Design an enzyme around this catalytic site. Sequence first.
Site, PDB file in Angstrom:
ATOM      1  N   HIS A   1      -0.363  11.429  -5.758  1.00  0.00           N
ATOM      2  CA  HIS A   1      -0.203   9.785  -5.793  1.00  0.00           C
ATOM      3  C   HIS A   1      -1.174   9.220  -5.074  1.00  0.00           C
ATOM      4  CE1 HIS A   1       1.608   6.048  -5.487  1.00  0.00           C
ATOM      5  NE2 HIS A   1       2.175   6.324  -6.544  1.00  0.00           N
TER       6      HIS A   1
ATOM      7  N   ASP B   1      -1.606   6.299  -3.642  1.00  0.00           N
ATOM      8  CA  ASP B   1      -1.284   5.456  -2.373  1.00  0.00           C
ATOM      9  C   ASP B   1      -1.052   6.712  -1.320  1.00  0.00           C
ATOM     10  OD1 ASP B   1      -1.056   2.792  -3.079  1.00  0.00           O
ATOM     11  OD2 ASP B   1       1.206   3.185  -4.003  1.00  0.00           O
ATOM     12  N   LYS B   2      -0.323   7.707  -1.671  1.00  0.00           N
ATOM     13  CA  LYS B   2      -0.421   9.008  -0.858  1.00  0.00           C
ATOM     14  C   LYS B   2      -1.539   9.797  -0.626  1.00  0.00           C
ATOM     15  CE  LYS B   2       3.563   8.952   0.922  1.00  0.00           C
ATOM     16  NZ  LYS B   2       2.756   8.889   2.509  1.00  0.00           N
TER      17      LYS B   2
ATOM     18  N   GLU C   1      -7.696   2.293   7.318  1.00  0.00           N
ATOM     19  CA  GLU C   1      -7.122   1.839   6.275  1.00  0.00           C
ATOM     20  C   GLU C   1      -7.942   2.517   5.040  1.00  0.00           C
ATOM     21  OE1 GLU C   1      -4.291   0.553   6.356  1.00  0.00           O
ATOM     22  OE2 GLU C   1      -4.263  -0.982   8.007  1.00  0.00           O
TER      23      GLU C   1
ATOM     24  N   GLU D   1     -10.698  -0.507  11.898  1.00  0.00           N
ATOM     25  CA  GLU D   1     -11.364  -0.617  13.354  1.00  0.00           C
ATOM     26  C   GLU D   1     -10.845   0.736  14.143  1.00  0.00           C
ATOM     27  OE1 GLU D   1      -8.481  -2.612  12.210  1.00  0.00           O
ATOM     28  OE2 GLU D   1      -9.934  -3.625  10.959  1.00  0.00           O
TER      29      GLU D   1
ATOM     30  N   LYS E   1       5.514  11.480  -9.261  1.00  0.00           N
ATOM     31  CA  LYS E   1       6.859  10.667  -8.754  1.00  0.00           C
ATOM     32  C   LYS E   1       7.934  11.459  -9.401  1.00  0.00           C
ATOM     33  CE  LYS E   1       6.037   6.273  -8.520  1.00  0.00           C
ATOM     34  NZ  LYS E   1       5.757   4.848  -8.747  1.00  0.00           N
TER      35      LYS E   1
ATOM     36  N   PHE F   1       0.903  11.197 -19.684  1.00  0.00           N
ATOM     37  CA  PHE F   1       0.356  10.930 -18.365  1.00  0.00           C
ATOM     38  C   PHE F   1      -0.897  11.715 -18.272  1.00  0.00           C
ATOM     39  CE2 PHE F   1       2.276  10.639 -13.649  1.00  0.00           C
ATOM     40  CZ  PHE F   1       1.157  10.387 -13.026  1.00  0.00           C
TER      41      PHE F   1
ATOM     42  N   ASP G   1      -4.212   4.282 -11.108  1.00  0.00           N
ATOM     43  CA  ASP G   1      -3.736   3.115 -10.200  1.00  0.00           C
ATOM     44  C   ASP G   1      -4.427   3.257  -8.946  1.00  0.00           C
ATOM     45  OD1 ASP G   1      -1.621   1.408  -9.234  1.00  0.00           O
ATOM     46  OD2 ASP G   1      -0.455   3.198  -8.554  1.00  0.00           O
ATOM     47  N   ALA G   2      -4.704   2.076  -8.603  1.00  0.00           N
ATOM     48  CA  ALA G   2      -5.307   1.818  -7.212  1.00  0.00           C
ATOM     49  C   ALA G   2      -4.474   2.416  -6.201  1.00  0.00           C
ATOM     50  CB  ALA G   2      -6.167   0.590  -7.020  1.00  0.00           C
TER      51      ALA G   2
ATOM     52  N   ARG H   1       1.420   1.774   1.669  1.00  0.00           N
ATOM     53  CA  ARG H   1       2.082   1.230   0.437  1.00  0.00           C
ATOM     54  C   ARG H   1       3.076   2.156  -0.167  1.00  0.00           C
ATOM     55  NH1 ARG H   1      -0.511  -2.928  -2.869  1.00  0.00           N
ATOM     56  NH2 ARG H   1       0.959  -2.298  -4.384  1.00  0.00           N
ATOM     57  N   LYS H   2       3.681   3.222   0.682  1.00  0.00           N
ATOM     58  CA  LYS H   2       4.801   4.156   0.391  1.00  0.00           C
ATOM     59  C   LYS H   2       5.528   4.253   1.612  1.00  0.00           C
ATOM     60  CE  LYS H   2       4.383   5.044  -3.726  1.00  0.00           C
ATOM     61  NZ  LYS H   2       3.824   3.655  -4.031  1.00  0.00           N
TER      62      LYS H   2
ATOM     63  N   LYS I   1      -3.043   5.474  12.250  1.00  0.00           N
ATOM     64  CA  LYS I   1      -2.782   4.382  13.748  1.00  0.00           C
ATOM     65  C   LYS I   1      -2.434   5.410  14.733  1.00  0.00           C
ATOM     66  CE  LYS I   1      -0.583   0.769  11.152  1.00  0.00           C
ATOM     67  NZ  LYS I   1       0.702  -0.052  11.016  1.00  0.00           N
TER      68      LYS I   1
ATOM     69  N   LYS J   1       0.030   1.657  18.544  1.00  0.00           N
ATOM     70  CA  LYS J   1       0.676   0.889  17.230  1.00  0.00           C
ATOM     71  C   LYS J   1       2.023   1.555  17.243  1.00  0.00           C
ATOM     72  CE  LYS J   1      -4.101   0.577  16.395  1.00  0.00           C
ATOM     73  NZ  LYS J   1      -5.184   0.911  17.609  1.00  0.00           N
TER      74      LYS J   1
ATOM     75  N   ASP K   1       4.093   0.455  15.401  1.00  0.00           N
ATOM     76  CA  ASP K   1       4.553   0.574  13.969  1.00  0.00           C
ATOM     77  C   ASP K   1       4.977   2.150  13.703  1.00  0.00           C
ATOM     78  OD1 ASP K   1       4.592  -2.031  12.924  1.00  0.00           O
ATOM     79  OD2 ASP K   1       2.542  -1.916  12.198  1.00  0.00           O
TER      80      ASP K   1
HETATM   81  C1  LIG Z   1      -3.216  -6.544  16.671  1.00  0.00           C
HETATM   82  S1  LIG Z   1      -3.803  -6.551  15.015  1.00  0.00           S
HETATM   83  C2  LIG Z   1      -3.354  -4.635  14.523  1.00  0.00           C
HETATM   84  C3  LIG Z   1      -3.830  -3.468  15.433  1.00  0.00           C
HETATM   85  C4  LIG Z   1      -5.597  -3.828  15.197  1.00  0.00           C
HETATM   86  N1  LIG Z   1      -5.887  -2.990  13.829  1.00  0.00           N
HETATM   87  C5  LIG Z   1      -6.173  -2.599  16.181  1.00  0.00           C
HETATM   88  O1  LIG Z   1      -7.472  -2.285  15.506  1.00  0.00           O
HETATM   89  O2  LIG Z   1      -5.716  -2.414  17.102  1.00  0.00           O
HETATM   90  C6  LIG Z   1      -2.596  -6.958  13.761  1.00  0.00           C
HETATM   91  C7  LIG Z   1      -2.556  -8.620  13.561  1.00  0.00           C
HETATM   92  O3  LIG Z   1      -2.050  -8.942  14.981  1.00  0.00           O
HETATM   93  C8  LIG Z   1      -2.905 -10.140  15.024  1.00  0.00           C
HETATM   94  N2  LIG Z   1      -3.893 -10.050  16.009  1.00  0.00           N
HETATM   95  C9  LIG Z   1      -5.394  -9.827  15.802  1.00  0.00           C
HETATM   96  N3  LIG Z   1      -5.746  -9.809  17.043  1.00  0.00           N
HETATM   97  C10 LIG Z   1      -5.069 -10.461  17.998  1.00  0.00           C
HETATM   98  C11 LIG Z   1      -5.090 -10.844  19.302  1.00  0.00           C
HETATM   99  N4  LIG Z   1      -6.127 -10.797  19.857  1.00  0.00           N
HETATM  100  N5  LIG Z   1      -4.045 -11.114  19.877  1.00  0.00           N
HETATM  101  C12 LIG Z   1      -2.792 -11.164  19.077  1.00  0.00           C
HETATM  102  N6  LIG Z   1      -2.616 -11.062  17.874  1.00  0.00           N
HETATM  103  C13 LIG Z   1      -3.855 -10.390  17.157  1.00  0.00           C
HETATM  104  C14 LIG Z   1      -3.702 -10.467  13.638  1.00  0.00           C
HETATM  105  O4  LIG Z   1      -2.518 -11.307  12.869  1.00  0.00           O
HETATM  106  C15 LIG Z   1      -3.490  -9.279  13.030  1.00  0.00           C
HETATM  107  O5  LIG Z   1      -3.623  -9.021  11.470  1.00  0.00           O
HETATM  108  C1  LIG Z   2       2.803   3.266 -13.229  1.00  0.00           C
HETATM  109  S1  LIG Z   2       1.464   3.187 -12.077  1.00  0.00           S
HETATM  110  C2  LIG Z   2       1.557   1.521 -11.769  1.00  0.00           C
HETATM  111  C3  LIG Z   2       1.400   0.318 -12.680  1.00  0.00           C
HETATM  112  C4  LIG Z   2      -0.095   0.323 -12.941  1.00  0.00           C
HETATM  113  N1  LIG Z   2      -0.953  -0.269 -11.748  1.00  0.00           N
HETATM  114  C5  LIG Z   2      -0.507  -0.367 -14.138  1.00  0.00           C
HETATM  115  O1  LIG Z   2      -1.735  -0.790 -14.395  1.00  0.00           O
HETATM  116  O2  LIG Z   2       0.358  -0.824 -15.005  1.00  0.00           O
HETATM  117  C6  LIG Z   2       2.172   3.603 -10.532  1.00  0.00           C
HETATM  118  C7  LIG Z   2       2.209   5.036 -10.473  1.00  0.00           C
HETATM  119  O3  LIG Z   2       2.991   5.670 -11.662  1.00  0.00           O
HETATM  120  C8  LIG Z   2       2.114   6.816 -11.972  1.00  0.00           C
HETATM  121  N2  LIG Z   2       1.668   6.866 -13.222  1.00  0.00           N
HETATM  122  C9  LIG Z   2       0.561   6.653 -13.593  1.00  0.00           C
HETATM  123  N3  LIG Z   2       0.137   6.668 -14.939  1.00  0.00           N
HETATM  124  C10 LIG Z   2       1.469   7.032 -15.407  1.00  0.00           C
HETATM  125  C11 LIG Z   2       1.836   7.498 -16.827  1.00  0.00           C
HETATM  126  N4  LIG Z   2       0.983   7.336 -17.722  1.00  0.00           N
HETATM  127  N5  LIG Z   2       3.218   7.857 -16.825  1.00  0.00           N
HETATM  128  C12 LIG Z   2       3.862   7.805 -15.780  1.00  0.00           C
HETATM  129  N6  LIG Z   2       3.720   7.522 -14.573  1.00  0.00           N
HETATM  130  C13 LIG Z   2       2.188   7.269 -14.590  1.00  0.00           C
HETATM  131  C14 LIG Z   2       1.339   7.252 -10.847  1.00  0.00           C
HETATM  132  O4  LIG Z   2       1.779   7.978  -9.808  1.00  0.00           O
HETATM  133  C15 LIG Z   2       0.851   5.782 -10.298  1.00  0.00           C
HETATM  134  O5  LIG Z   2       0.263   5.659  -9.122  1.00  0.00           O
END
Ligand SMILES: C[S@@+](CC[C@H](N)C(=O)[O-])C[C@H]1O[C@@H](n2cnc3c(N)ncnc32)[C@H](O)[C@@H]1O
Ligand SMILES: C[S@@+](CC[C@H](N)C(=O)[O-])C[C@H]1O[C@@H](n2cnc3c(N)ncnc32)[C@H](O)[C@@H]1O
Lengths: 380, 380
Positions: free
Chosen positions: B14, B16-17, B42, B55, B166, B235, B243-244, B249-250, B270, B274, B276
Amino acid sequence: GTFLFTSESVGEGHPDKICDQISDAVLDAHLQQDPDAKVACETVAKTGMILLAGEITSRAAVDYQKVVREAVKHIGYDDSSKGFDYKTCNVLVALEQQSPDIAQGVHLDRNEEDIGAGDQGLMFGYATDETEECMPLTIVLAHKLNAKLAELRRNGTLPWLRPDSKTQVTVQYMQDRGAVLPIRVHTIVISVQHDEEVCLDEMRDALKEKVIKAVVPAKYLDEDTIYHLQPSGRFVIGGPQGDAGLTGRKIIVDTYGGWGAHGGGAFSGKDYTKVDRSAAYAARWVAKSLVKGGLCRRVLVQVSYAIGVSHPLSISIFHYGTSQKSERELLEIVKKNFDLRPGVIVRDLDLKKPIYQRTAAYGHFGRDSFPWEVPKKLKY
Amino acid sequence: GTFLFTSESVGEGHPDKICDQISDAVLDAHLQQDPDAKVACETVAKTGMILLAGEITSRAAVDYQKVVREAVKHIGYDDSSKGFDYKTCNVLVALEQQSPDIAQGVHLDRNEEDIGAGDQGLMFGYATDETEECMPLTIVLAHKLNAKLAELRRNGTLPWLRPDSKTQVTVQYMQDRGAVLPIRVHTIVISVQHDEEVCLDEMRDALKEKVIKAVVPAKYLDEDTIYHLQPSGRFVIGGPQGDAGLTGRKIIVDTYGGWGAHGGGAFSGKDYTKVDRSAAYAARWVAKSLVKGGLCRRVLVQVSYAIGVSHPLSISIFHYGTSQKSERELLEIVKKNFDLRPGVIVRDLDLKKPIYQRTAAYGHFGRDSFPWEVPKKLKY
Ligand SMILES: C[S@@+](CC[C@H](N)C(=O)[O-])C[C@H]1O[C@@H](n2cnc3c(N)ncnc32)[C@H](O)[C@@H]1O
Ligand SMILES: C[S@@+](CC[C@H](N)C(=O)[O-])C[C@H]1O[C@@H](n2cnc3c(N)ncnc32)[C@H](O)[C@@H]1O
Ligand SMILES: CN(C)c1nc(=O)n(CCO)c2cc(Cl)ccc12
Ligand SMILES: CN(C)c1nc(=O)n(CCO)c2cc(Cl)ccc12
């Protein structure tokens, strides 16, 4: 019976939120010309870059460069000194048509009311009587703190503020037969990007006096409230330069701040056939209708779908013990009053209207009397 | 007392995965050389493209081209006929160092045990005694259906299968003093990418007989169970071409499938600072320890942090009515037994170990006896 609960929010210039707003600016631009546009626009933001990736099939002629740059300008990133500039950033586009395999399975040659869900998935709606707008106080306050920062930045009161911000509010609650009652604010966090010149003490004083006191009622603040203001000590680098942003990475800020539940789907950049958005809006509408209808003090609603199938596969209700009616009885009332097919939701909630960029910061719920915020009068 | 509940899962291919697995392959590659690497990777995937954005500050020398392509090869996208090929796709890199403003506020010149949280945020852990692994049956079954598809694809049993899939499972439950008891499977959805040659009837028959019956106990299936197998009808286009995909996103597939709650943070890409990720793993560890310790049948735990601050700002417990002990008493037991500072969690859960790519498909919880899955013996 007391407990703590925490929610967060982020500002318009938080990099993930920038992506949600751009994705929805793209969606609105398409809907302004083609109400039936099929849009699945993801945005990525990093230093100097906005990338659009996804799938769009539409009759609209959209100038992506202009739409993206205007959204960034509105947010306030307009100079390299702020770390990002709409005038000079890179805008890259990797947009293709919607897969024809999805189109044939979802909507091609289908009556609109009988259109299939655009994907499988689960979605939740939630409502709580703890505020008039039926939202948790923790997230309402967190959103208002970010809105206040943006207001003071835009009116020149605090000219050292930059667009990227985060807030977090911990409330101490009491409970009364499953309903929740806010008592006081236990902890507030605010982090906001700032210019090179302002010192930490000036910022912390302004955040307390001009931001927190302007937002949070004094009755909730006391000598024990804990304040973490600019807790990192320095936040000059910010926006996409400080942290890469992506669409759909603030789904809890977009919804209920940890309260209720989430099915995982992002809202921004998606037209109504993507039930991740439309059915979550309809589920909020159901939950708010149950609470404003006096059936529950708080309630969670689940709905789910299969791609290509119009009727939901399941609907479920959890009232936290806040109704004299059983969850089975509330589910029967929901099924008698609502039709959660996507092709009916679009009509009830007017989901071809280009109002989506307005939803993409400060939460999708509890604001502006959008159609999903106007309760339905229930018959039972 | 009966109700329905639905959860979903997705396969390794998938889109996103794919991004989560690549982000974690990058994290592991850094940790293999530098256990203290600071990573926030990311990934974005679209037709022919993997983009890395984020980063990283690390002493490791990582060949991103090789690491990304090997992860895609493992997933199974190895030919243009499948819509994506590790050998020939574009790999773009937009990685910068961690912001020095974040570094100075979080970890520079700090004792490891006293390192600050890498961000603010809220996180939840959940556990339920309805399965031995303390996970909801809905999501356990959904994950196993995707794993079964991958197994039959890899062993050549169903050579028409492709990596993108899915699944979604709706279970009918009963409830017993707040605990939940599965009764039967109400509905199953499976959508899987396939080759151009296989017909719909062959696929639907194989999905029922070789996938569902091989995974779901017959006692849960009956004449009323609803099956939506390849409900879109076609499919062939799939993976990033259909699908991007984006990292993070999961998040509900990664956690509890709609049960419990989520704080919004993504796990993949991460390092331990982090929260999270690390604090969500520790919160799962707490919840599972309470359930395996016989204190609750099911429980939800919230924790929250401020950037740069080591101790959590709040901890909260919700036992759904499944303990004789109050939530206040359970919170006291948690505070006596756990220390949720990130610099202590890293030691308890061995979070510098490069095992993260293993977590990035089929859920982070309820599998493989990772440290957060081994209950702590509680003293009270
Ligand atoms: C802390 S950053 C996430 C971790 C980061 N990607 C890293 O490289 O460690 C997440 C969010 O916190 C905020 N952030 C960025 N720099 C920060 C800073 N110096 N102090 C506090 N919050 C910050 C921004 O809103 C950013 O999108
Ligand atoms: C249906 S697509 C999401 C909507 C899509 N971005 C669009 O342009 O409509 C989301 C997920 O469903 C699955 N998918 C993609 N094409 C499909 C299809 N033809 N039938 C069923 N599931 C599908 C894939 O896992 C995909 O990442
Ligand atoms: C009424 N109480 C005690 C709560 N009510 C909720 O609705 N939830 C669930 C939030 O999704 C809680 C979740 C936690 Cl971690 C703690 C308390 C509660
Ligand atoms: C025990 N029951 C009735 C449930 N238990 C939960 O824990 N939740 C919350 C899922 O996050 C439910 C959520 C819905 Cl929409 C329906 C039922 C339940």
